[PDB]
Scaffold this active site. Sequence first.
Site, PDB file in Angstrom:
ATOM      1  N   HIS A   1      50.985  29.441  45.188  1.00 60.40           N
ATOM      2  CA  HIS A   1      51.263  30.792  44.727  1.00 60.40           C
ATOM      3  C   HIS A   1      52.108  31.606  45.727  1.00 60.40           C
ATOM      4  CE1 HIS A   1      48.311  33.117  47.035  1.00 60.40           C
ATOM      5  NE2 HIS A   1      47.292  32.378  46.600  1.00 60.40           N
TER       6      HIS A   1
ATOM      7  N   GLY B   1      46.004  38.678  52.539  1.00 62.15           N
ATOM      8  CA  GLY B   1      46.682  37.899  53.569  1.00 62.15           C
ATOM      9  C   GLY B   1      45.918  36.678  54.050  1.00 62.15           C
TER      10      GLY B   1
ATOM     11  N   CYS C   1      44.977  34.068  52.236  1.00 64.44           N
ATOM     12  CA  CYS C   1      45.292  32.870  51.468  1.00 64.44           C
ATOM     13  C   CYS C   1      45.858  31.802  52.392  1.00 64.44           C
ATOM     14  CB  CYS C   1      46.254  33.204  50.332  1.00 64.44           C
ATOM     15  SG  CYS C   1      45.570  34.342  49.096  1.00 64.44           S
TER      16      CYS C   1
HETATM   17  O1  LIG Z   1      43.520  37.411  45.010  1.00 65.31           O
HETATM   18  C1  LIG Z   1      44.407  37.115  45.798  1.00 65.31           C
HETATM   19  N1  LIG Z   1      44.168  36.843  47.098  1.00 65.31           N
HETATM   20  C2  LIG Z   1      43.241  37.343  48.043  1.00 65.31           C
HETATM   21  C3  LIG Z   1      42.471  36.453  48.789  1.00 65.31           C
HETATM   22  N2  LIG Z   1      41.331  36.751  49.421  1.00 65.31           N
HETATM   23  C4  LIG Z   1      40.920  38.006  49.379  1.00 65.31           C
HETATM   24  C5  LIG Z   1      41.614  39.048  48.723  1.00 65.31           C
HETATM   25  C6  LIG Z   1      41.237  40.409  48.833  1.00 65.31           C
HETATM   26  C7  LIG Z   1      42.016  41.391  48.292  1.00 65.31           C
HETATM   27  C8  LIG Z   1      43.180  41.073  47.610  1.00 65.31           C
HETATM   28  C9  LIG Z   1      43.572  39.772  47.467  1.00 65.31           C
HETATM   29  C10 LIG Z   1      42.808  38.711  48.020  1.00 65.31           C
HETATM   30  C11 LIG Z   1      45.873  36.943  45.321  1.00 65.31           C
HETATM   31  F1  LIG Z   1      46.623  36.320  46.279  1.00 65.31           F
HETATM   32  F2  LIG Z   1      46.420  38.186  45.179  1.00 65.31           F
HETATM   33  C12 LIG Z   1      45.884  36.218  43.999  1.00 65.31           C
HETATM   34  C13 LIG Z   1      45.774  36.922  42.804  1.00 65.31           C
HETATM   35  C14 LIG Z   1      45.738  36.256  41.593  1.00 65.31           C
HETATM   36  C15 LIG Z   1      45.823  34.875  41.564  1.00 65.31           C
HETATM   37 CL1  LIG Z   1      45.829  34.061  40.033  1.00 65.31          CL
HETATM   38  C16 LIG Z   1      45.943  34.164  42.750  1.00 65.31           C
HETATM   39 CL2  LIG Z   1      46.071  32.432  42.731  1.00 65.31          CL
HETATM   40  C17 LIG Z   1      45.978  34.827  43.966  1.00 65.31           C
END
Ligand SMILES: O=C(Nc1cncc2ccccc12)C(F)(F)c1ccc(Cl)c(Cl)c1
Lengths: 305, 301
Positions: free
Chosen positions: A41, A143, A145
């Site tokens: 992603h 951040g 991920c």
């Molecule tokens: O939820 C996400 N990551 C986060 C990871 N870990 C914690 C988070 C906290 C706040 C915001 C985001 C976070 C994201 F990268 F935005 C995301 C959103 C939708 C999808 Cl389908 C995918 Cl694969 C990834």
Amino acid sequence: SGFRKMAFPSGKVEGCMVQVTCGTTTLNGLWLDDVVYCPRHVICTSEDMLNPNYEDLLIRKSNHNFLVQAGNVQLRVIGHSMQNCVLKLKVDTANPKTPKYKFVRIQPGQTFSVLACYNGSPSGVYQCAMRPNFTIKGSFLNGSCGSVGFNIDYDCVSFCYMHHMELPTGVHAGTDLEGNFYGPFVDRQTAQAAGTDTTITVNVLAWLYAAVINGDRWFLNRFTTTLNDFNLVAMKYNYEPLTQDHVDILGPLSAQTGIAVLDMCASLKELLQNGMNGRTILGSALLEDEFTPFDVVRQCSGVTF
Amino acid sequence: SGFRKMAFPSGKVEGCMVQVTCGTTTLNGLWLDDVVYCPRHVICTSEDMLNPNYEDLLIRKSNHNFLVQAGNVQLRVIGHSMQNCVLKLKVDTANPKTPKYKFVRIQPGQTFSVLACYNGSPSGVYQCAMRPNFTIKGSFLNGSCGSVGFNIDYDCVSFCYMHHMELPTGVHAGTDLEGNFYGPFVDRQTAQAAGTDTTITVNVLAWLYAAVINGDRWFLNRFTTTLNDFNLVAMKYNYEPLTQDHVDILGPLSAQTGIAVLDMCASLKELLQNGMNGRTILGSALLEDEFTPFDVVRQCS
Ligand SMILES: O=C(Nc1cncc2ccccc12)C(F)(F)c1ccc(Cl)c(Cl)c1
Ligand SMILES: O=C(Nc1cncc2ccccc12)C(F)(F)c1ccc(Cl)c(Cl)c1
């Protein structure tokens, strides 16, 4: 004495964390040999995420679009390929700090250490369990991920998890290092929810043995139970079924403490029907399910890495 | 989202752990530059422990009595000196993995990560707090002496604790890296007991702010309290007094959540009076006191 939620020493994994930037997105990568692994992603925009054709999005990218940074040194991407939901960025330089490693896929109930990273820099390490609903109750901000979960087996790091997303209930979802999600999750912006969770029974029994080893015996009783009667009670309390494999794996703890697994099961059964009655076990007023039988043995015997 | 007991990454400290052997005793040492730091009780026998004269015992030792091992490499001790309850073994090789470091003495309520080691090898990392009674509720077996506690704010490791002993109640006592014990403890087998422990009030308040930041508001109430009335109540539950310093420290969390410090104190007073009534706060059925205001801000922002 003492029983703590203990993670594996994170040093071997710290030397692998890198920052991966593609467009406006910056997340973490795992640099092992000459490959940087990260969530696919990273190639997506807010619109791309709604309905992503990852092969189509990746074919439009060139190596120079991915900015990989290891400390204050920029790595040069010389290739890119996708394997399930993980992006593999071939780099020119092999990581000199690459430990002995394996990619392993864990089962629900298994525990692992998470090295939470932001901008390729490790900020904290904590212990987790893969819930029966395939989510992890992690601690992650924007951040994070690309942060990874791992275990250490002698001198070998077993990478078992890569962080991809946070579900609406604040729990976390991710993949193994081969890019296959744990659970029915997709890296698509769509309505997704964690299923109803259950308690990891074998782990609660392991933690009750850890409490006995530490001198907490108030919950012990003269009673035993059949495995079938215990599972009938476990079903009622949203506890995972206890299998003969679980009984066998608890054997060494049963032998050390002198409390048979079915004898400890009768203790757990009474705790479920009657509660703790104002008492605590290892400083906790709830039954802990994030210590496996192997974690209890490792901590109450002192295995090193 | 999420709130976990989180330790600092232990890598910078792992590259410092060595094994120190003196006679029949093997414990851990902290190898920084060309000095290995370890508890001075490594020079003792069980017989010496009752009333040891460490200066007398150390004067009888020579450099080759101390066997220092870093991985599968034996280091050569070229000097030894004692500083309070820590033995400083000068070695002939500077640790190439020595991080940017400082020795800091912490106060009760402060938290730190512990890298538990056996035979100079790290086995696990966990988060601890220095209790108001100056003990730590660690997880240590025999052979863990010399394991250290630290914080890694920025790229600098602040060493704040070295494990020396386990008290009869299963809690742990040790020193800062200058060898001064935390608490009224001595490195000798005399009758020693941890004083009655109290709850770190400022940390429970910080953790209630962490819960509000994470969306947990059930425990909040319409009440406020005076600091004096709060302390009169908190004292009856074995909670540490909340000082004006603690109130000031909680200011940023109060500003972020919109809940005045004395308003969160009134929620704490109510939780102490009623209990949780089957509810949890951040997955816990007890009030957590091992997250400082600084830890909450670090983890939540
Ligand atoms: O939820 C996400 N990551 C986060 C990871 N870990 C914690 C988070 C906290 C706040 C915001 C985001 C976070 C994201 F990268 F935005 C995301 C959103 C939708 C999808 Cl389908 C995918 Cl694969 C990834
Ligand atoms: O308590 C000790 N160490 C241990 C540390 N941590 C945990 C232990 C668990 C079991 C056995 C021992 C443990 C000790 F090193 F033996 C010791 C004993 C007396 C004194 Cl006065 C001193 Cl300074 C040190």
